[PDB]
């Protein structure tokens, strides 16, 4: 068995199919899910929250992406030649003292920088991001890190 | 289905009759699954009764009066002496066709399964055992195409708008709920499928 | 050795059909759909480098 | 002269062709096995 | 591994075989343990040593 | 031990055309020179009955309908084959010990087994071609119910 | 048994797709039969499908396990008494407290002396060696029965 | 999991909670490359969703 | 602001930017009808009096 | 695999009228192409009407015809054509179909027909949007010229005016071989004729490079003292403009002549496609000929 | 391809059916005669059939909450709409099993 | 939502075991004896056996009625995966390259990468997936 | 999928409904109920 808790339905596709039955006062604690009610072995309303999941949410292995980084780096760049456009970064290091006069000197070139990946993960809407039309799905690996 | 089809044109009333005097309208065949379903369904008409089948194949040998016609005019007229006799005697009606006359002499019994269809008895039969472990496909199995079509992304006239499902469902006022862009179909399971 | 000049390959009394063996490196096909028959050819191609 | 030379070796049945191997002095060598091969030799025909 | 020649030479019994699915499917999907499926007429059952 | 409890051959149900009830859909006649005929045509001289009309009506006249039916061609075949070693051991017995008589008996049995299987395949194919010629003739239910 | 009439060689992609479709249909729909439905016709159809779907045996037992009036036994359905208390109380028009014929002896089965010779010499056993040796040198390739 | 997972097709039917339909039986058998192509790669469609 | 799609446009296909394709209110080909100063880019445009 | 059936039965699904069976009985022991090589083939695959396109590319037809299996007609009867794909080496009679007179001792090649259409009014088994098409069994020099004029009409039509092309097709469509005039149906330049032109021009460029110091001046030294109608007729197709040979080195000349033979064969095989029959003895009315090399 | 009503159905039985390759992922046209042909009643009538193409999940969960026979009904909201499937194929066939 | 609504058609292959009813002796099939023919070679001697048959009808009207009885499965997915025009028009490109090399990376389609062997019959242009649970697929478009 | 409920009131109107009330899947604005695909919470423990 499996079940979700604490999801987020979209607001622009929101609806109600139980109008005559239920009527909830319009406070935000009923307008955002944070619980889940199941049934026990007896027909009894049990309840799970984020509070009781602390034996999983706070583990130090959840915050260590080093085996995740190792598995991400062993299969390296995407071998697809159609997507040789997103893996371009120049992350240099230079002094900062001469920067205040080098800032009109930076635009003395007329060549743009390629687009960063974290910028490329933001121009998808809520519902196409799980589709294959996204390129950056091999970058999203963990809700605590950026790969 | 039984009365809808017409009958044949040659009549062999001696062959393919059931014991204790019953005539057979025709043969109705399907697969073993459908006939299993029918026999469990229409069990008040199934009878496993013996059918007097023909023993061996027919016989349609020629004549010496047909041989010179086959040589010269490249044609065969069956019962050529009978045709010439009925011409010379001047009779309009030959007594029997040369095909129902052709063979099917003896009769052998066999027990099959027959059913009553409005006092028009027909033969139940399934061809499972002849395509039992072969390499071809049973032609009683088949594939049928149905063409489905569906619209998505239309615009209803809002000047003559209406709702009939107001008492069951309700939407919040947003433009994405006001304008259709997507649609929702099913899979070959009961699975909601998103199409935009 | 007993070489076979023209015809099939078989044992005495024809009890066993011998098979022609070729190593994997020299094998080469130019179609994904072989016909009912396909002939075999021996290709020597020279690299004049 | 003669960049490519081709002679007709024979003919086969186009269905018994399968990959196999021969072992000899415990040296496995992956080969292609033509089961019903009929030898029909030809001269070394040359082309460019 | 399995002497399949002794199956083709020794006299068998005659049984009404009722496989569940089609028999070529049960052969090609490897329900049974050891198989000797082929086509044509193998002369393999003749060279007895 | 390597106890073999039995060797099991598969027996075949020698179905015939007339054994099947589908022969009642047919009318089987052996013609000895079918490979010499070109086509079989049938002709019908059908006249329909008139009725006497009432007063002041356009009455009908005599009619004659000469309709024609034709034949079909659909041969079938089976390519059953025999190894040359089987034909060698079929009629030859050299140094007639037990071990050669066994091979002779097995050669005779694989020949007759191939003959029986060929005849069974021919009967199955005749049934199949009959069903094929029927299914290219039967219209579906809706058009017949409509007519 | 629903796909036994379709497939005729090793499975392709679409057949195994339909197989998994009907797997997830039937394993979900008929997880707990008697715990869900309690009508006669559906459970009778289910038990009928279960009884026909299994393939038969190979050994001929023509006379043993047979009732009076020649009704041969086809199968046996064993379960706990709790299930049988619902089976017999729900389907009570189909039960008959009848007496069948049972084999009163075990299947005694001995070893032949030349089987002992083959057992010593070749580490193997050919059951009914005298019958095989007779039918080999005789000429008939079909035995009456196995061992 | 992400809070934007479409619940109507991922929490109302019997679904594999891994993210993809990881049914190995849909893969043609004894093929190891196609298996990781079906359960690990992402520049292609996914079964059942 | 709303005639372009700032959540989508950057980069370019030709020398013209990507936002020049999404709407006619962001490209040099569509001129306003009462033009008082000639625009900066007139590559494909040839003005004629 | 089951063996290739030497007894190929062709079936018929159309209602054969009696004149159609009569015209089918004329074509006993003739050549027909078939790509399938089954045992019970239909009538659609038989012949060449499966490959006749709106392009009327005769070079495309020659390209596909070389891959088709040639067989012989035998024992025509009601709805049955017993075909015999002949094994290589033996002999059996064939029959002509086109008006091409033969000899003894020459060779025969397969060819798609010339002026094919309603000009000679072939009613060769016409039924239901299908015609029985027959490949021509033509002799050796006709098969040489019918591809030589093809390749010349390919090579000439580059970089030149269309009125030159329309004046060049009519100069190179007639063939007056052996008391008969033939016309080629629409010689059209396609990619196959292009790749044939590429092979031809590369081979002749390489043999022009391969020419030694003596073989290019042999006619140039010969035409000072010799007088013959052959030498005069071959001289005028050249431009206008004792002595010593430069260096006789026959050890090099053997290699030059050997590779020149390879280049000449590499030019040669563009017009010498296949010997398929060697005619031994003809009928006196030339309706048939017993010949060898069948297959 | 319009003829007499007995010749049209005979044309429909013989040759107007088309084939579909049945061992690959996309719908390919098979080689003729190798596998059996496939009937198509849409070729006879020259129509097509509608299926359950609702607009939103508001009007989709209503049909799923509904019991038997709900799929033959076509409902309409202001901008949203449901087209009801005419033949009860998605309602009862896949639940027969 | 742009200024046009598209529709989509698709076919669906269902598997069906039909039932055929026919009248008694609706046709009279005639056969001849099975004709054996040999084909002898070095390694084997296959025996082909032909049998020319003929069927003549024995009715004036439709003597035999078939019908569609039972459906076991949906061999398609009944899905929404649309069929691409970039496979069924495998050589159409743009007149300009850098809009074409942007559209392919927008739709996800492989490059134009054979032409003579494409217009006669075709080829496996769009390959199979590595696995499928829902069988085969088809969906087309109508603007 | 097992029967899960966001709020108390939706579970209450699930329990108030009769047989087959667990089969549906009601959906409010920000609240949702997934229904069990098999009624093994409906009539297993009540059936005993």
Task: Please provide the DSSP assignment of J238-249 as one string.
Answer: S-------S---
Q: Whole-angstrom Cα distance, residue L126 to residue K25?
A: 9
Q: Whole-angstrom Cα distance, residue J246 to residue J241?
A: 19
- Taking the CA of residue A31 as centre, how many other CA atoms within 13 Å lie in the half-sphere pointing to its CB? 6
Residues 6+ apart with CB under 8 A from J227: none
The answer to whether the CB of M10 falls within 8 A of the CB of A39 is no
Do L108 and A83 make contact, defined as CB atoms within 8 angstroms?
A: no
Specify the 3-state DSSP secondary structure of L30. Answer: strand
Residues 6+ apart with CB under 8 A from J179: J101
Residues 6+ apart with CB under 8 A from K58: A15, A16, A17, B169, B170, B171, B177, K77, K80
DSSP state letter for J126: B
DSSP E strands in chain J: the ranges are: 8-10, 31-34, 40-41, 69-77, 80-84, 91-95, 107-111, 136-139, 174-175, 182-183, 277-282, 288-292
Which residues make beta-bridge pairs with A85? Answer: none
Total count of residues recorded for chain J = 295
Q: How far is M1 from chain A (nearest CA, A)?
A: 5
The separation between CA J276 and the C-alpha centre of its own chain, rounded to angstroms, equals 10
Here the tokens at position G95 are 């039960």
User: For this experimental structure, what is the resolution in angstroms?
Assistant: 4.0
Q: What are phi and psi of J101, to 5 degrees?
A: -75, 145
Of chain B residues 77-106, which have a CB less than 8 A from chain L? 99
CA distance readout (Å), F80 to B1, B99, F111, G57: 41, 34, 11, 32
Residue at token pair 């299987």 = F117
End-to-end CA distance of chain G: 31
Q: How far is B133 from chain K (nearest CA, A)?
A: 18
CA distance readout (Å), J261 to J255, J268, J273: 10, 10, 18
Q: Whole-angstrom Cα distance, residue G118 to residue G140?
A: 24
Q: How far is F60 from chain L (nearest CA, A)?
A: 24
CA distance readout (Å), F14 to F117, F119, L32: 9, 9, 20
Q: Whole-angstrom Cα distance, residue K85 to residue A35?
A: 38
Q: Which chains touch L (3 or more CB pairs under 8 A)?
A: A, B, C, F, G, H, I, J, K
B136 touching E (Cβ < 8 Å)? no
Name the percent of chain M in helix, strand, coil, to the closest 5. Answer: 20, 10, 70
Here the tokens at position J6 are 């030497």
Do E19 and B133 make contact, defined as CB atoms within 8 angstroms?
A: yes
> Which of A9, A72, A130 is the mutation pick for testing H, counting most H CBs within 10 A?
A130
Q: Which chains touch A (3 or more CB pairs under 8 A)?
A: B, H, I, K, L, M
Do E46 and F85 make contact, defined as CB atoms within 8 angstroms?
A: yes
Q: How far is B135 from chain G (nearest CA, A)?
A: 6
- Checking C21-26 for CB contacts under 8 A at 24+ apart, the result is C21/D20, C21/D22, C21/D31, C21/D32, C21/D33, C21/D34, C22/D31, C22/D32, C22/D34, C23/D29, C23/D30, C23/D31, C23/D32, C24/D19, C24/D30, C24/D31, C24/D32
Residues 6+ apart with CB under 8 A from J137: J31, J94, J96, J97, J98, J100, J108, J109, J110, J111, J276, J277
Residue at token pair 């097995």 = F106
End-to-end CA distance of chain B: 45
> Which of F31, F85, F116 is the mutation pick for testing L, counting most L CBs within 10 A?
F31
Here the tokens at position A147 are 């790969």
- Taking the CA of residue A28 as centre, how many other CA atoms within 13 Å lie in the half-sphere pointing to its CB? 0
Q: Whole-angstrom Cα distance, residue L8 to residue B147?
A: 11
Question: H or E element: which one contains L15?
Answer: strand L6-23
Q: Which residues of J touch L116 (CB under 8 A)?
A: 191
End-to-end CA distance of chain A: 32
Do B169 and A12 make contact, defined as CB atoms within 8 angstroms?
A: no
DSSP G19-44: HHHHHHHHHHHTSSSTTT---HHHHH
Q: Whole-angstrom Cα distance, residue M39 to residue M37?
A: 7
Q: Which chains touch K (3 or more CB pairs under 8 A)?
A: A, B, F, G, L, M
L38 touching A (Cβ < 8 Å)? no
DSSP E strands in chain K: the ranges are: 49-50
Q: How far is C41 from chain L (nearest CA, A)?
A: 22
DSSP state letter for M32: B
DSSP state letter for J282: E
Q: Whole-angstrom Cα distance, residue H26 to residue H22?
A: 9
Q: Whole-angstrom Cα distance, residue K47 to residue B147?
A: 8
Q: Whole-angstrom Cα distance, residue E22 to residue G9?
A: 8
CB contacts < 8 A, H to M, total 15
Chain H residue with CA closest to M32: the answer is H7
Q: Whole-angstrom Cα distance, residue A144 to residue A69?
A: 13
Burial of K14 (0-12, 13-18, 19+ CB in 10 A): exposed
Here the tokens at position G143 are 């035995």
Angle at B30 between CA K44 and CA F132, to 5 degrees: 60
Q: Whole-angstrom Cα distance, residue F94 to residue F97?
A: 8
Here the tokens at position J272 are 């010498």
- Checking G97-104 for CB contacts under 8 A at 24+ apart, the result is G98/G67, G98/G68, G99/G67, G99/G68, G100/G65, G100/G66, G100/G67, G100/G73, G101/G63, G101/G64, G101/G65, G101/G66, G101/G67, G102/G64, G102/G65, G103/G64
Q: Which chains touch B (3 or more CB pairs under 8 A)?
A: A, E, F, G, H, K, L
CB atoms under 10 Å from CB of H40, counted, come to 10
G24 touching H (Cβ < 8 Å)? yes
Chain J residue with CA closest to L51: the answer is J40
Q: Rounded to 10 degrees, what is the CA torsion of I33, I39, I43, I48?
A: 50
Here the tokens at position L63 are 């003597």
DSSP state letter for F97: -
Q: What are phi and psi of B128, to 5 degrees?
A: -70, -40
Q: Which residues of B touch G48 (CB under 8 A)?
A: 40
Which residues make beta-bridge pairs with G143? Answer: E13
Angle at J285 between CA J271 and CA J276, to 5 degrees: 25
Residues 6+ apart with CB under 8 A from G66: G72, G73, G100, G101
The separation between CA J133 and the C-alpha centre of its own chain, rounded to angstroms, equals 16
Interhelix angle J250-268/J191-209, nearest 10 degrees: 170
Q: What are phi and psi of E14, to 5 degrees?
A: -105, 115
Question: H or E element: which one contains F29?
Answer: strand F29-30
Q: Which residues of A touch I8 (CB under 8 A)?
A: 123
Nearest one of J223, J183, J197 to J56, comparing CA atoms: J183
CA distance readout (Å), J219 to J214, J226, J230, J238, J239: 10, 10, 12, 10, 12
The answer to whether the CB of F75 falls within 8 A of the CB of J11 is yes
DSSP E strands in chain B: the ranges are: 17-18, 22-23, 26-30, 46-47, 50-54, 107-111, 113-115, 122-126, 141-152, 170-171, 183-186, 192-195
Q: Whole-angstrom Cα distance, residue B31 to residue J271?
A: 61
Q: Whole-angstrom Cα distance, residue J292 to residue B77?
A: 45
Do F136 and K41 make contact, defined as CB atoms within 8 angstroms?
A: no
- Torsion sign over Cα J103, J106, J108, J111: negative
The answer to whether the CB of G141 falls within 8 A of the CB of G131 is no
Q: Whole-angstrom Cα distance, residue B149 to residue L8?
A: 6
Q: Which residues of L touch A82 (CB under 8 A)?
A: 104-105, 108, 110-111
Residue at token pair 């910028």 = A119
> Which of G9, G12, G16 is the mutation pick for testing H, counting most H CBs within 10 A?
G16
Specify the 3-state DSSP secondary structure of A55. Answer: helix
Question: H or E element: which one contains E13?
Answer: strand E12-15
Q: Whole-angstrom Cα distance, residue L67 to residue J17?
A: 35
Specify the 3-state DSSP secondary structure of J35. Answer: coil
> Which of G24, G25, G26, G27 is the mutation pick for testing H, counting most H CBs within 10 A?
G24
Number of H helices, E strands in chain D: 0, 5
Here the tokens at position L128 are 């199979």
Edge to edge, what strands does the sheet with J69-77 contain?
A: J31-34, J69-77, J80-84, J8-10, J40-41
> Which of H12, H22, H28 is the mutation pick for testing G, counting most G CBs within 10 A?
H28
Q: Whole-angstrom Cα distance, residue G26 to residue K95?
A: 10
**Solved with:** cryo-EM
Q: Whole-angstrom Cα distance, residue I19 to residue I24?
A: 9
Q: Which chains touch D (3 or more CB pairs under 8 A)?
A: C, J
CB atoms under 10 Å from CB of L38, counted, come to 10
């Amino acid at each position: 068995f499996f079940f979700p808790v604490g999801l987020y339905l979209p607001e622009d596709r929101g609806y109600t199919t139980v109008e005559s039955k239920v009527k909830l006062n319009d406070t935000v604690r009923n307008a955002l899910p944070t619980t889940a009610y199941l049934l026990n072995r007896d027909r009894a309303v049990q309840k799970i929250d984020f509070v009781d999941a602390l034996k999983t949410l706070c583990h130090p292995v959840l915050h260590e992406p080093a085996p995740c980084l190792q598995t991400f780096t062993e299969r390296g760049p995407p071998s697809e030649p159609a997507m040789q456009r997103l893996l371009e970064c120049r992350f240099q290091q230079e002094p900062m003292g001469g920067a205040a006069r080098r800032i009109p000197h930076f635009y003395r070139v007329r060549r743009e920088v390629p687009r960063t990946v974290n910028e490329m993960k933001q121009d998808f809407v809520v519902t196409d991001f799980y589709k294959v039309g996204n390129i950056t799905l091999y970058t999203e690996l963990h809700p605590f890190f950026d790969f | 289905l039984a009365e809808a089809a017409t009958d044949s044109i040659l009549d062999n009333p001696t062959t393919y009759t059931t014991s204790s005097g019953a005539k057979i309208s025709g043969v109705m065949v399907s697969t073993a699954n459908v006939m299993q379903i029918i026999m469990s369904l229409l069990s008040s008409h199934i009878t496993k009764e013996t059918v007097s089948a023909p023993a061996t194949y027919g016989n349609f040998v020629l004549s010496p009066e047909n041989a010179v016609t086959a040589i010269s005019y490249h044609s065969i007229l069956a019962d050529f002496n009978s045709y010439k006799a009925h011409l010379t005697s001047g009779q309009p009606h030959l007594p029997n066709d040369s095909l129902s006359q052709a063979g099917a002499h003896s009769l052998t019994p066999l027990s099959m399964d027959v059913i009553r269809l409005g006092e028009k008895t027909v033969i139940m039969e399934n061809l499972r055992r002849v395509y039992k472990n072969t390499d071809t496909k049973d032609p009683l199995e088949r594939n049928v195409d149905l063409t489905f079509f569906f619209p998505v992304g239309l615009y209803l006239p809002e000047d003559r708008g209406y709702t009939t499902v107001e008492s069951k469902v309700k939407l919040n006022d947003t433009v994405r709920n006001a304008l259709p862009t997507t649609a929702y179909l099913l899979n070959r399971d009961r699975a909601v499928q998103k199409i935009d | 050795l007993t070489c076979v000049m023209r015809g099939y390959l078989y044992n005495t009394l024809k009890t066993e059909v011998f098979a022609l063996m070729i190593p994997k490196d020299m094998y080469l096909t130019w179609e994904e759909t072989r016909g009912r028959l396909q002939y075999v050819y021996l290709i020597i191609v020279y690299d004049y480098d | 002269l003669c960049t490519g030379v081709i002679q007709k070796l024979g003919w086969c049945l186009a269905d018994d062709i399968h990959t196999s191997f021969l072992v000899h002095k415990e040296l496995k060598l992956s080969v292609v096995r033509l089961d019903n091969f009929s030898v029909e030799l030809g001269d070394f025909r040359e082309f460019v | 591994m399995e002497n399949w020649s002794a199956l083709e030479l020794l006299p068998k019994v005659g049984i009404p075989t009722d496989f569940l699915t089609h028999v070529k499917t049960s052969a090609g999907e490897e329900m049974f343990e050891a198989l000797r499926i082929y086509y044509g007429d193998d002369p393999e059952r003749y060279n007895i040593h | 031990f390597e106890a073999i409890f039995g060797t099991f051959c598969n027996r075949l149900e020698w179905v015939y055309f007339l054994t099947s009830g589908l022969a009642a859909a047919a009318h089987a006649i052996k013609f000895h020179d079918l490979n010499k005929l070109t086509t079989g045509k049938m002709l019908f001289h059908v006249q329909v009955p008139r009725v006497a009309s009432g007063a002041g009506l356009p009455t009908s006249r005599q009619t004659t309908i000469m309709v024609t039916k034709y034949s079909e061609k659909s041969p079938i075949t089976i390519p059953f084959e025999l190894s040359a070693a089987c034909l060698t051991y079929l009629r030859e017995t050299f140094e007639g010990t037990i071990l050669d008589k066994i091979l002779n008996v097995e050669a005779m049995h694989t020949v007759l087994r191939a003959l029986k299987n060929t005849a069974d395949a021919m009967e199955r194919g005749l049934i199949h071609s009959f069903l094929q010629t029927l299914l290219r003739k039967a219209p579906p239910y809706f058009v017949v119910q409509t007519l | 048994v629903e796909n036994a009439t379709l497939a005729r060689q090793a499975l392709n992609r679409i057949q195994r797709s339909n197989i998994l479709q009907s797997f997830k249909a039937k394993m979900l729909a008929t997880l707990f039969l008697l715990n869900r439905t309690r009508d006669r016709d559906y459970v009778l159809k289910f038990l009928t499908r279960l009884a026909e779907a299994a393939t038969d045996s190979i050994l001929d037992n023509p006379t043993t396990y047979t009732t009076s009036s020649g009704a041969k036994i086809s199968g046996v359905m064993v379960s706990t008494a709790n299930v049988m208390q619902i089976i017999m109380s729900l389907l009570s028009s189909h039960i008959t407290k009848e007496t069948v014929s049972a084999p009163a002896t075990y299947g005694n089965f001995v070893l032949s002396p030349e089987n002992a010779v083959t057992a010593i010499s070749y580490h193997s056993i050919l059951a009914d060696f005298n019958s095989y040796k007779a039918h080999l040198t005789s000429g008939q390739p079909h035995l009456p029965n196995d061992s | 999991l992400t809070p934007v997972t479409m619940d109507v097709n991922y929490f109302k039917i019997p679904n594999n909670p891994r993210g993809r339909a990881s049914c190995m039986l849909a893969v043609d058998p004894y093929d190891t490359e196609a298996a990781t192509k079906a359960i690990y790669d992402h520049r292609e469609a996914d079964a059942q969703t | 602001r709303i005639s372009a799609l700032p959540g989508l446009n950057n980069g370019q296909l030709a020398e013209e930017p990507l936002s020049a394709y999404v709407n006619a209110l962001h490209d040099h080909r569509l001129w306003p009808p009462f033009v008082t100063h000639l625009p900066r880019n007139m590559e494909g445009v040839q003005v004629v009096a | 695999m089951a063996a290739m059936e030497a007894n190929i039965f062709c079936t018929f699904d159309h209602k054969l009228s009696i004149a159609d069976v009569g015209k089918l009985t004329k074509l006993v022991a003739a050549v027909v192409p078939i790509p399938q090589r089954l045992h019970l083939i239909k009538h659609y695959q038989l012949g060449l009407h499966q490959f006749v396109d709106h392009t009327r590319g005769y070079v495309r037809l020659r390209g596909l015809l070389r891959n088709m299996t040639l067989t012989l007609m035998r024992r025509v009867e009601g709805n049955q054509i017993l075909l015999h794909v002949p094994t290589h080496g033996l002999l059996y009679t064939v029959l002509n179909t086109g008006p091409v007179t033969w000899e003894k001792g020459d060779a025969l090649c397969v060819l798609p027909p010339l002026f094919h259409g309603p000009l000679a009014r072939e009613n060769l088994l016409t039924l239901g949007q299908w015609e029985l098409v027959l490949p021509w069994i033509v002799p050796m020099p006709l098969a040489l010229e019918i591809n030589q004029r093809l390749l010349i009409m390919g090579l000439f039509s580059l970089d030149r005016s269309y009125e030159e092309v329309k004046a060049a097709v009519q100069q190179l469509q007639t063939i007056t071989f052996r008391d008969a005039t033939f016309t080629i149906p629409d010689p059209v330049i396609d990619q196959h004729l292009l790749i044939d032109m590429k092979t031809a021009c590369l081979s002749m460029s390489m043999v022009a490079n391969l020419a030694s110091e003596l073989t290019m001046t042999y006619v140039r030294k010969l035409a000072l003292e010799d007088s013959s109608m052959l030498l005069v007729k071959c001289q005028e197709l050249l431009m206008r403009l004792p002595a010593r040979p430069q260096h006789v080195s026959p050890d090099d000349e053997i290699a030059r002549l050997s590779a020149l033979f390879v280049m000449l064969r590499q030019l040669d095989d563009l017009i010498r496609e296949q010997v398929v029959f060697t005619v031994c003895d003809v009928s006196p009315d030339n309706k048939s000929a017993t010949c060898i090399f069948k297959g | 391809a319009n003829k007499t009503l007995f010749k049209t159905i005979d044309e429909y039985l013989l040759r107007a059916k088309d084939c579909i390759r049945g061992d690959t992922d996309t719908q390919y046209v098979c080689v003729e005669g190798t596998e059996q042909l496939i009937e198509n009643p849409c070729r006879l009538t020259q129509e097509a059939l509608p299926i359950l193409s609702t607009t939103t999940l508001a009007l989709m969960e209503t049909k799923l909450k509904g019991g038997a026979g709900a799929f033959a009904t076509s409902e309409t909201h202001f901008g949203n709409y449901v087209v009801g499937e005419i033949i009860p194929l998605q309602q009862s066939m896949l639940f027969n099993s | 939502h742009p200024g046009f609504a598209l529709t989509a058609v698709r076919t669906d292959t269902f598997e069906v075991d039909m039932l055929l009813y026919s009248g008694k002796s609706c046709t009279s099939v005639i056969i001849n004896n099975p004709i054996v023919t040999k084909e002898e070679r070095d390694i084997s001697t296959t025996y082909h056996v032909t049998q020319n048959i003929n069927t003549v009808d024995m009715g004036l009207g439709y003597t035999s009625n078939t019908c569609v009885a039972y459906v076991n499965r949906v061999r398609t997915d009944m899905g929404v995966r649309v069929q691409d025009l970039f496979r069924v028009f495998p050589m159409n490109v743009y007149r300009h390259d850098e809009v074409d090399r942007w559209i392919r990376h927008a739709a996800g389609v492989e490059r134009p990468q054979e032409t003579i062997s494409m217009l006669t019959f075709g080829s496996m242009s769009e390959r199979n997936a590595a696995a499928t649970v829902h069988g085969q697929k088809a969906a087309c478009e109508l603007i």
